[PDB]
């Protein structure tokens, strides 16, 4: 059996980025999918630390919280900076990614029809700090932090892809971002994952919006 | 002092890292930012995400309260004994951050009409951290392992502000209650929490708590 197990609802959501990590890194993993009926039965839920998914297992290490998983994988597979200073910068990117993700998730599930124009109007000002980060790291030719990939790249990558779905062309205002996205998705294993039914046949979110 | 904390004159998302610094005998400087200052827009335009806190470690400049916590935990050895404990630590902090966000939305966006439901949901919101204590040496040490981590300071602050928001919310949780007492009594932290620069600082900016 693979050492890793992803326990989630059948969507990309907060598991998209860590799945891309694992795929690009050539790791193997079991997917455990949870239906509404099963969630509604309440036994799994009660057993989750914060009563939510994703749930992740690495051997007998059981983790909750999507960014915990990302950092845990970034730690063990060496995608967490080359040094302590880089690691901080990697954290600083991911906190920003999370911040925007929280807003995205709020729009998608609590206020899509009403808030979408305001959201898209505000999108440029929200993406710009990431464009700025690229420009300050080797002309944005390599990765979000340093010259080696990190978990934040995989998280940022997902974030930009879902926003291109939400707001087609949004990256037209951000040359570095746009290319970044093309480049990281050209990575052979990731590209193969992204084109696969495993990724493509899952809806981004669970309410049918995007 | 090698550290600089740039922020608004409230505890808020700087309370945990202040406690961390004081408890670890670290020295730091406070650049307090006023409305006016914030209003000229030079600072803000300068901030990666247009927000505070901003932090300095020698020549390193950071943003994001949780990046600063992690940076301090990492460089001062407050991040678990190993990768496995370091994961546990993140799992506590991310959870602390989820409740805090809820706390923050209640306080600034929905205090009058959301407080009853907030406080009724509270115990189920605090049970995970009591359970976490329950699984680690019967809760007589720390939130993870037997050495303090950045998550302790962050969870400590979370529990203190809730005790102000809903006095006695810890009364049904004996490990949480003893833990708050234990950590709050650590000499350097104890002195800091009794000091004016803590006590005379408003928790939040809009006068609600
Ligand atoms: N800080 C944590 C947070 C993790 C987290 O949010 N988990 C949620 C995800 S469900 C997710 C969610 C919602 C609505 C729906 C609605 C329809 C739906 C159909 C098919 C699949 C999903 C999957 C997820 C999901 C939803 C669906 C929405 O309303 C929710 O807010 C969430 O965004 C959950 O487990 N909910 C179960 C419950 O609390 O009892 C982390 O980063 O890991
Ligand atoms: N993910 C980040 C989040 C950091 C963050 O939220 N920063 C905010 C803090 S201001 C804080 C805040 C708000 C309202 C007020 C209202 C009155 C007020 C009076 C005196 C002091 C403060 C201090 C903070 C503050 C406020 C006050 C509220 O509306 C805000 O949401 C915040 O909770 C900020 O810099 N605002 C400047 C602006 O963006 O332009 C992190 O973890 O560090």
Domain boundaries, chain B: 2-78+187-208, 79-186
Tokens of B208: 């609600």
Contacts of B163 (CB under 8 A, 6+ apart): B169, B170, B180
Task: Say how many C-beta atoms besides its own lie within 10 A of residue A190's C-beta.
Answer: 20
CA distance A125 to A105: 18
Contact assignment for B91 to A132 by CB distance below 8 Å: no
Task: Say how many C-beta atoms besides its own lie within 10 A of residue A183's C-beta.
Answer: 14
Phi, psi of B28, rounded to the nearest 5 degrees:
-155, 165
**A133 touching B, CB under 8 A?**
yes
Contact assignment for B66 to A95 by CB distance below 8 Å: yes
Among A205, A208, A209, the mutation site with the greatest number of ligand 1 atoms within 8 A of its Cβ is: A205
Query: Distance from A195 to chain B by nearest Cα, in Å?
Result: 31
Q: Nearest Cα to A185, choosing from A71, A54, A23, A7?
A: A23
Do A70 and A94 contact (CB within 8 A), yes or no? yes
**B63 touching A, CB under 8 A?**
yes
Q: Which fold has domain B79-186?
A: Glutathione S-transferase Yfyf (Class Pi); Chain A, domain 2 (1.20.1050)
Instruction: Please report where in the chains the tokens 């079991």 appear, as a residue.
Output: A30
Tokens of A163: 């926003």
CA distance B179 to A5: 33
Identify the three-state secondary structure at position B204. Answer: coil
Judge if the beta carbon of residue A72 lies within 6 A of ligand 1. no
DSSP B36-94: HHHHHSHHHHHSTTS-S-EEEETTEEEE-HHHHHHHHHHHTT-S-SSHHHHHHHHHHHH
Interface test with B, best of A14, A85, A144 (most B CBs within 10 A): A85
Residue A135 belongs to what H/E stretch?
helix A112-135
Judge if the beta carbon of residue B53 lies within 6 A of ligand 2. yes
Query: Distance from B196 to chain A by nearest Cα, in Å?
Result: 31
Identify the three-state secondary structure at position A191. Answer: helix
Q: Report long-range pairs for A134-137 (Cβ below 8 Å, ≥24 apart).
A: A134/A176, A134/A177, A134/A180, A135/A176
Is the N-terminal amide bond of B53 cis, ω within 30° of 0? yes
Q: Which residues make beta-bridge pairs with B31? A: B6
Instruction: Please report where in the chains the tokens 């059996």 appear, as a residue.
Output: A1
CA distance A50 to B90: 13
Q: What is the 3-state secondary structure (H, E, C) of A45-114?
A: HHHCCCCCCCEEEECCEEEECHHHHHHHHHHHCCCCCCCHHHHHHHHHHHHHHHHHHHHHHHHHHHCHHH
Resolution of the experimental structure, in angstroms: 2.1
Instruction: Please report where in the chains the tokens 């326990």 appear, as a residue.
Output: A7
Nearest to A50 among B74, B86, B95 (CB): B95
CA distance B52 to B66: 12
- Which DSSP letter does residue B141 get? S
Nearest to A65 among B83, B95, B132 (CB): B95
CA distance A191 to A184: 8
Interface test with A, best of B65, B68, B72, B90 (most A CBs within 10 A): B90
Angle of helix B83-109 versus helix B150-165 axis, rounded to 10: 30
Q: Does the domain formed by A80-187 have CATH 1.10.1740.110?
A: no
Angle of helix A84-110 versus helix A112-135 axis, rounded to 10: 160
Q: Which fold has domain B2-78+187-208?
A: Glutaredoxin (3.40.30)
Residues from chain A contacting residue B128 (CB–CB below 8 Å):
49-51
Q: Where are the alpha helices (DSSP H) in chain B?
A: 15-23, 35-40, 42-46, 65-75, 83-109, 111-134, 150-165, 174-184, 187-194, 196-199
Instruction: Write the residue with the smallest CA distance to atom 25 of ligand 2.
Output: B205
**CA A129, A135, A141, A146: dihedral to nearest 10 degrees?**
-70
CA distance B30 to B5: 5
* Torsional sign, CA A45, A46, A52, A54: negative
Residues from chain B contacting residue A49 (CB–CB below 8 Å):
91, 95, 128, 131-132
Q: Name the experiment that determined this structure.
A: X-ray
Phi, psi of A120, rounded to the nearest 5 degrees:
-70, -35
Q: What angle do CA A155, A94, A91 make, to 5 degrees?
A: 135
Q: Nearest Cα to A50, choosing from B78, B149, B126?
A: B126
Query: Distance from A47 to chain B by nearest Cα, in Å?
Result: 11
What's domain A3-79+188-209's superfamily in CATH? Answer: Glutaredoxin (3.40.30.10)
Do A178 and A81 contact (CB within 8 A), yes or no? no
Judge if the beta carbon of residue A47 lies within 6 A of ligand 1. no
Angle of helix A66-76 versus helix B83-109 axis, rounded to 10: 150
């Amino acid at each position: 059996m693979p050492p890793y197990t992803v326990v989630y609802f059948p969507v990309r959501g907060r598991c998209a980025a860590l799945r891309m990590l694992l795929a690009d890194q050539g790791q193997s993993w079991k997917e455990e999918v949870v239906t509404v009926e099963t969630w509604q039965e309440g036994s799994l839920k009660a057993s989750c630390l914060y009563g939510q998914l994703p749930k992740f297992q690495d051997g007998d290490l059981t983790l909750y919280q999507s960014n915990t998983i990302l950092r845990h994988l970034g730690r063990t597979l060496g995608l967490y900076g080359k040094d302590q200073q880089e690691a901080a910068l990697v954290d600083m990117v991911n906190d920003g990614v999370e911040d925007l993700r929280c807003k995205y998730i709020s729009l998608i599930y609590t206020n899509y029809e009403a808030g979408k124009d305001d959201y898209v109007k505000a999108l440029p000002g929200q993406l710009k700090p990431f464009e700025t980060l690229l420009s300050q790291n080797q002309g944005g030719k390599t990765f979000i932090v340093g010259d080696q990939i990190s978990f934040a790249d995989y998280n940022l990558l997902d974030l930009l892809l879902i926003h291109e779905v939400l707001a087609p062309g949004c990256l037209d205002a951000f040359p570095l971002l746009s290319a970044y996205v093309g480049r990281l998705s050209a990575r052979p294993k990731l590209k193969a994952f992204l084109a696969s039914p495993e990724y493509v046949n899952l809806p981004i979110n669970g309410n049918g919006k995007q």
